[PDB]
């Protein structure tokens, strides 16, 4: 089974929460009808390069339904220091500044 990449806008339904593990859980709403599709999601320190940093905790985020405005949860493992949660592609992608230390 080959998924295509979700290409619509996302929005955070709630402000990303920090877990007791030091990870961040996020819930997003997806405006597309091209589900099923794979969610673009990563951490980045450089917004020019968008080089992936940290780890995605969710094993392959997919929107499973064509249903418009469906909601999905994912968990990210941010690196130490400052970074950005980055979700989606294009001019409409959304980011959230994060900071971690331990």
């Amino acid at each position, epitope marked *: 089974v*080959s998924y295509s990449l*979700c*290409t619509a806008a996302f929005t955070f339904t709630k402000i990303p929460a920090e877990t007791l593990h030091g990870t961040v859980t996020v819930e997003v709403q997806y405006a597309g009808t091209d589900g099923p599709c794979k969610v673009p999601a990563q951490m980045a320190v450089d917004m020019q390069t968008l080089t992936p940093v940290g780890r995605l905790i969710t094993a392959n985020p997919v929107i499973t339904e*064509s249903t418009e405005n469906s909601k999905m949860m994912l968990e990210l493992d941010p690196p130490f220091g400052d970074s950005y949660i980055v979700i989606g592609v294009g001019e409409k992608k959304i980011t959230h500044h994060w900071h971690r230390s331990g």
Partner: antibody
Amino acid sequence: QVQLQESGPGLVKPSETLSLTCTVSGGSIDTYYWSWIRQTPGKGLEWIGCFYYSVDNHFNPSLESRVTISVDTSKNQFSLKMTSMTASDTAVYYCARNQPGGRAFDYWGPGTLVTVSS
Amino acid sequence: EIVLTQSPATLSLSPGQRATLSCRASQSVSNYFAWYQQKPGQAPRLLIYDTSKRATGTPARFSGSGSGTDFTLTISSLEPEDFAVYYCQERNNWPLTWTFGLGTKVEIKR
């Protein structure tokens, strides 16, 4: 908003390779899915394949073994290559943009006609 | 994959009449079908998408409806310039593939 323009050879010899190029303005082809579609006056509209730049390709299963894509984000152009052309492959060929976040194609080039003949 | 069947093949109506075009799918995928208008010598143009939404520049007399396996394009009051072939279209998920019907040709009586 987005405009696309096909360019191709017009005529292809039987069993030779077709090459087509799409020039896009109003949008960078390094984002979103872009497709090649074709239409024979004979058997309707047929999707050939698509790419999302630096992510993946997807191809019509019946045509996949004959088809190759290329992308030049500096010229905002992408290409179709289809080997072993026969008279069945005579058709109008289009490039098109996959609707961001949708199931349709929202912008189309005007189409270029390809005749397979010796 | 999925087969889209359109009917009638041809439609001949006077301007001002209401045109109703059918698209039936062999099995259901999503509730979000598209329709294209093709005029002679031109590429298809996206008319309706997600079953009921109008593409940019689609006049209000065009509307779409349907769900599951049955979808309909409605031209509430036909105009001479609506002469064209109309295609319905859907995206298969597995295997990923984009599929069109063979079209309905709308001719204008006068």
